[PDB]
Amino acid sequence: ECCTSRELVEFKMDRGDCEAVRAIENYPNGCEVTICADGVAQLGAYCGQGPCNIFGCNCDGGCLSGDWSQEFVRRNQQYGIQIIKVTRLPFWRPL
Numbered sequence: 761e762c763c764t765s766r767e768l769v770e771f772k773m774d775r776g777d778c779e780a781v782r783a784i785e786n787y788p789n790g791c792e793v794t795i796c797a798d799g800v801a802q803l804g805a806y807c808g809q810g811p812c813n814i815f816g817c818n819c820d821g822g823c824l825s826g827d828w829s830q831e832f833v834r835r836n837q838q839y840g841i842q843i844i845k846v847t848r849l850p851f852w853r854p855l
């Protein structure tokens with residue numbers, strides 16, 4: 761299994777600041793984060809449940825699972841996440 765997909769999410773917060781959800785600041789009052797499908801900021805390079813190889817494949821446990829940016833919103837509902845852009849990467853699969 762390969763787990764190279766991720767989402768770059770640009771958002772604002774009705775309460776709190778970007779670091780509270782493991783995000784960076786993106787210009788005054790904006791935040792940005794890269795997430796796996798579980799709606800949590802990436803811990804690494806790839807979105808395996810456990811380690812992948814350098815290609816992002818042969819991922820132990822397969823991929824992290826979830827509802828992508830919608831799960832990021834739900835997990836962090838106490839901050840009131842206002843998504844302004846979502847970009848799913850890569851844009852296509854090799855071949």
Ligand SMILES: [Ca+2]
Nearest residue numbers: 761762822823
């Ligand atoms: Ca598969």
Ligand SMILES: [Ca+2]
Nearest residue numbers: 826827830831
């Ligand atoms: Ca859903």
